Amino acid sequence: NPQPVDTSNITIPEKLEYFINKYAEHSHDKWSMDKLANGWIYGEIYSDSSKVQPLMKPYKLLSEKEKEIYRWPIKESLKTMLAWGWRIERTREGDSMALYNGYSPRAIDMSNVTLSRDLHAMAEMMAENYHNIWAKKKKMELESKGGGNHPLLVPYDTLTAKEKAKDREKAQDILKFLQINGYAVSRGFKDLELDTPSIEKRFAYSFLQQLIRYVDEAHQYILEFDGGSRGKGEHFPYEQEIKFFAKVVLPLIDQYFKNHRLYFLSAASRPLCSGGHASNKEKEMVTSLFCKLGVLVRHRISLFGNDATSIVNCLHILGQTLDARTVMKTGLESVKSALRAFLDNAAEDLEKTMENLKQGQFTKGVTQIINYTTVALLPMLSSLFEHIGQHQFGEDLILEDVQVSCYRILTSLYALGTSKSIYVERQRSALGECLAAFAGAFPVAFLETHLDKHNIYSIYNTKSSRERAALSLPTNVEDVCPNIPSLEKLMEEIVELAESGIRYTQMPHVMEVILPMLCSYMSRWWEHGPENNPERAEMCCTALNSEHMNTLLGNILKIIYNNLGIDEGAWMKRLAVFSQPIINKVKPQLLKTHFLPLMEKLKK
Amino acid sequence: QLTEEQIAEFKEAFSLFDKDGDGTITTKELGTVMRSLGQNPTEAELQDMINEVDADGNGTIDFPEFLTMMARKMKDTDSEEEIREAFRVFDKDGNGYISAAELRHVMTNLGEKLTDEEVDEMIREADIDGDGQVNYEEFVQMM
C-alpha cells in the first residue's frame, strides 16, 4: 500500500526559477545530444510520419509546452524536497552569474565529482519516494487494466540495483546539477536539545522501572494468593500472570545481571573509562529491587513450583551485583527502610528458626520456612557478606546500627553452628563459606575488641555515648555479641586443636565454620593492620605478627597432615574454595620449600 | 499409564534424534546417527527396521508412535541406572566424588576443547552443594 507524499501545501519559490530554467536548458541540451547521437537531426517541419525532428533548435526557440515538461518533473521534485523540510540557503553563484548576465551545445557531466554520504542517504531516500510515486501511477494504471501484476510493485528496497538504477541516477544527477550550480541544500532541522544527563533515557533505567512495578504486581498477586490461601481453592485467574513472572522476569533478570555484571559492579571504575558508568540512582533502585525480591521470596517458597532454586540463583547474582557505598553516600528513604527491615526480617527469621527447629521436631508454612532456612537462606546471607567484603562497601554500609544487627545475627548464626543435628550436618559446608564471607565483610575485628577501640571506624566509638544509648547498643562492643570469641581466644583454640588432633566426626562444626571464617577474615586486616598497612601505626584495626602467622600456619598444616590419614575428604575440598584466597595470600617465599611437602603429598 | 516426567524425558529424547525439528525421523536423519555411533547400515536395513515401529505407515515415526515403542521396553529404572552407570565410569578417581580434572578429559573424547579452569567454574555451578568435586548427587542435580 503506497502512502503518498503531499505536495499541495508547498509551492515553488521564484528565486529558484533561475536554476529551474538553467536545468531545463541543461535537460534540453542532454536531450538534444541524445537525439543527435541517435541520428535525429534538424527538420524543416515537425512531422512524425516523415520521421524527422526540428527540435535541435535552441531553448530560446523551444515552445512553452516543451518547457512545461521540463519544469513539471523539476518542480514536483522541488515540491517533494521542500515538503520534506529541507531548507535551502544563500550561495554566491546567484550574485556571480548576476554580475555575468549549426550550434553545438555541451552538457556538463554529473559523473565526475562525488556526493557526500549524508546527502547520499538523502538522495537514496528521495529516489525511494520517486519510485513510490511511480508505483502510485503504475498502480492506478493496474486497476485500469484490471490484471497483469507488474513485478516492480515490490518496495524500493526489495527492488534490485538495476531496478533502482533509474530513480537513483535521477537523484545523483539532479542534486549534482544543483551543486554544480552551487545551490547547497541540506537537512532542515538541527537538534534543539539533548537530555543526556537524564537517567530516564538509559535503557537499563527504563527496564528497571519495568522490573520493579512487575515485582510489585507479583507481590500483589502473592497477596491475592494469600487471601485465597485461607480458602481451599488457590486456582485464580492470576495463574497466567504469576507463571509469566516466574518464567520470564526472573530468567530475564538472571541473564541481564550476568551479562552486565561489569556495568553494575563498577560505574566505569576499574574497566572501560569511556562509558559503562552505572548511575548512582540506578544502583539505588537495583538495591531496592533486590530487597523487594528478597521480601517476595520470603515465607512464600511453597507456592513456587520448584523454580525456587532459580529464584535463589537470581538473588545470589543480585547479591554479587549489589553496591552499598553509593547507597550510603546517597540513599533514598525507601531503600534505607528496606535494608533496615531486611535486617529485621533476618532477625525474626533466625529467631523463629531457633524456636521451631527445636520445638517442632514432631508435629505448609513450617515446612516452607524450614526449607528456606536449609537451602534458600544461608547461601543468600553468604553472598551478601561476600559482596560486602569483596567491594569493602560494607565499611559504610553496615556502619551504624548494622554493626550491631550483623553481630547479633552473628551470635544467632554461631549458636546455630554450635548446635548440631542431621540437618546441621547436611549444612556444615554452607556455614564455612558463609562465615568466611561474613568475616571478610565485617569492617572491625569482631573477634578482637582490643584494638577495635583504637579503630576509629566502629559502631560504638563513632556513634559515641548518646547514639550509643539511642541504638541497640548495651555500651559494650564485645558484649553485644557474646558467643563469638576473640582473635586471642581463637588462637589458643587453634593451638590446642592442633595439639589434640580431633576427628571430623567429633567436632564438624569447628572446621566447617571457623576455618573458612579465618581464611577470609585475615584478608581485610592485612590492609587494616601493620600487616599490609605498615603506616597508620597503632591506629590499625588489629595488630598481628609474622610469628603468630607462622604459628597458625603450622597448626593448620599439622592438623591437615594428621588429617591426610582419613583420606582428607572432599570437605576440605569444600574449604579449598576459600583456601584459594589463602594460597594467593601465601608469599612465594613459602612457595619455595615451605609448602612443597604438602603439595607433593597431594600429588601422592 | 506412562508417567508424566517420563514423556517429558521422552520429549527431549525424541528431539535428540529429531534434528530437523518437525517431529518426523526420516531414514536419512536416523541413518547419520548410526554412522556417528560406528555402525554402517544399508539403506534397506534402515528402511526395513523403520517400518515395524511405524504403525501409521507414513514412513516417519511421530512421537505418539515413538511412545509406543518406548512403552514396548522396560525403562522402569534404566533411566537413573544409566545416570549412575555414567557416574560410576566417569569416577576415574573412585573416591565416590568425580573430580573436574578428568571432566575435560572425557569431553575431549567427543572433540570439545573447553579450557581446564572454566569447567570447574561450571562444576562450581553444579556444586551448589559446594563439594568442589562432583558426586552422583550433583549429577542428579545436573540431571
Ligand SMILES: [Ca+2]
Ligand atoms: Ca506413522
Ligand SMILES: [Ca+2]
Ligand atoms: Ca572421579
Ligand SMILES: [Ca+2]
Ligand atoms: Ca560435589
